[PDB]
Design a protein around this ligand. Structure first.
Ligand code: SF4
Lengths: 434, 106
């Protein structure tokens, strides 16, 4: 581990515990998902993006300038975590494309982190040769570089470093006659340098991921890594943390106002459907019941609420008892865990059991068409421009970010200060707004 | 139409025989039991088959349905619909799109 950035082409050969193995896998999955969501929400170059992702790195300790702390733990964490993601992600072309997008975002940000003094030794450590030119050479060949340069306006050849490269390394660059050539050597600004290195890095990663895809069947024989490595990205929440066992004071009568002021669109419309129908299908019923369990409602409050609502449902109260009260108590109590003991996370809500005719569960952004999304947004009184970028985000299949933007719009705020993954987190933050 | 039913049965038998002979084409190449045992060639064919079936899996996930079971010889697809004709035309559209994605697959 000689430098912070590193190109990942030498797999580690150390020995680590299972707990550290899972910690690295989950931490790097969280980092890449955060990179995806932040890059979707913001522009890739803004200081807000830079500082927010720096804070994400600091809370996940994945990169920093060399010191006593950096040498042992963080860069090694980066190494093994990246390779276990290689194993997780080499399954499919779609996952490979996703991983490549996020790792290019990560590597470009990290390169922007590195100060200009250390980029020379980084390229030297990169094992592929590139020679920076001297100031005298730059001054002598400035006119040639400007004359042969791309549409960059003016003669200004600023502080940006210029390197010497074999011509075969920049084929697509020079083949447009937008660079000067000297004895088979090119001279290039920093933006095109990083473009070249990222293209080469994507080529090497594509080949390596294909090779690991050829190596998956042998390495999947293990039983303690199959159920994880099948689903690091597909169906794992990034520490949603809205686990059962929370506390709070909720008044049963206030449920309507709390639904219209603090519920994510899916749960809001589910509660309205319950109020207007006094009956739900299995999926929506279980979803809303365990959500109400999560928000802090106690067992007696939940039972009384559901019984009262089925009073308007017109079935026998003893039938209610025998049929459902067992199910609600089981959800609040004993095992059957991870399906009835837990509050549903957003990634689960979107990927599991899409609603059908007569169903109202499921995230509406992913499970209903844009015209009905627009109708619902009009019914919820959001500005037409806000609805416009909501639909733009829906076209970009970033449903969680769309829900985020809906949250700031309904709360009349700018940034929620997080990235939502759990409806109970949505509700907790809305209560934090008071 | 307007053909002798016996000849129709003969045509059906010939078509089914062609189907099974095709299906066994890969059989004759990958087995230590065979004359032409080609470990690398068989591995490449199986890798491509797994890749294409799995790609079909995620993309049919994209087209807003759900898959529940498939191993290189059948794909189980849930519909979330109760109209048989709608389900059939959904199958037809996914068949057509997968046929234009991969030319010779039937
Ligand atoms: S993003 Fe999650 S919380 Fe928001 S509406 Fe969709 S499923 Fe509900």
């Amino acid at each position: 581990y000689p430098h912070c950035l590193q190109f990942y082409l030498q797999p580690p050969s150390e020995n680590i515990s299972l707990i550290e193995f899972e910690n690295l896998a989950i931490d790097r999955v969280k980092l890449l998902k955060s990179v995806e969501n932040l890059g979707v929400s913001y522009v890739k170059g803004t200081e807000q993006y830079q500082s927010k992702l720096e804070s994400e790195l600091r809370k996940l300790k994945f990169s920093y300038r060399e010191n006593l702390e950096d040498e042992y733990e963080p860069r090694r964490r980066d190494h093994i975590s990246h390779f276990i993601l290689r194993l997780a992600y080499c399954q499919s072309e779609e996952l490979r494309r996703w991983f490549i997008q996020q790792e290019m975002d990560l590597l470009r940000f990290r390169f922007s982190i590195l100060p200009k003094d250390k980029i020379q030794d980084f390229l030297k450590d990169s094992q592929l040769q590139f020679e920076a030119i001297s100031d005298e050479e730059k001054t002598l060949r400035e006119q040639e570089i400007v004359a042969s340069s791309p549409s960059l306006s003016g003669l200004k050849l600023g502080f940006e470093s210029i390197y010497k490269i074999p011509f075969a390394d920049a084929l697509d660059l020079f083949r447009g006659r937008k660079v000067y050539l000297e004895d088979g050597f090119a001279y290039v600004p920093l933006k095109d340098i990083v473009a070249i290195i990222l293209n080469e890095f994507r080529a090497k990663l594509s080949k390596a991921l294909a090779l690991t895809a050829r190596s998956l069947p042998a390495v999947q024989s293990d039983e303690r890594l199959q159920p994880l490595l099948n689903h690091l990205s597909h169906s794992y929440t990034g520490q949603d943390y809205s686990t059962q066992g929370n506390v709070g004071k909720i008044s049963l009568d206030q449920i309507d106002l709390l639904s219209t002021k603090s519920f994510p669109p899916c749960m809001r419309q589910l509660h309205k459907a319950l109020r207007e129908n006094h009956h739900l299908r299995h999926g929506g019923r279980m979803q809303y019941g365990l959500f109400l369990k999560g928000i802090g409602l106690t067992l007696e409050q939940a039972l009384q609420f559901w019984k009262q609502e089925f009073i308007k449902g017109k079935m026998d109260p003893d039938k209610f008892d025998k049929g459902y009260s067992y199910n609600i108590r089981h959800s609040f109590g004993k095992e059957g865990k991870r399906t009835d003991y837990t509050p549903f996370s957003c990634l689960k809500i979107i990927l599991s059991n899409p609603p059908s005719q007569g169903d109202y569960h499921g995230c509406p952004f992913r499970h209903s068409d844009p015209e009905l999304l627009k109708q619902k947004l009009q019914s919820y009184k959001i500005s037409p421009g806000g609805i416009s970028q909501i639909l733009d985000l829906v076209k970009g299949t970033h449903y969680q970010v769309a829900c985020q933007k809906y949250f700031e719009m309904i709360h009349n705020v700018d940034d929620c200060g997080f990235s939502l993954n759990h409806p109970n987190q949505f509700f907790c933050e809305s209560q934090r707004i008071l | 139409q307007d053909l002798n039913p016996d000849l129709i049965l003969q045509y059906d038998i010939r078509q089914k025989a062609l189907k099974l002979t095709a299906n066994s084409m890969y059989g004759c190449l990958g087995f230590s039991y065979s004359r032409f045992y080609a470990k690398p060639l068989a591995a490449l064919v199986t890798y491509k088959g797994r890749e294409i079936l799995m790609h079909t899996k995620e993309m049919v996930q994209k087209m807003n349905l759900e898959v529940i079971y498939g191993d290189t010889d059948s794909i189980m697809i849930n519909t979330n619909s109760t109209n048989l004709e709608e389900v059939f035309k959904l199958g037809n559209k996914v068949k057509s799109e997968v046929n234009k994605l991969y030319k010779l697959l039937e």
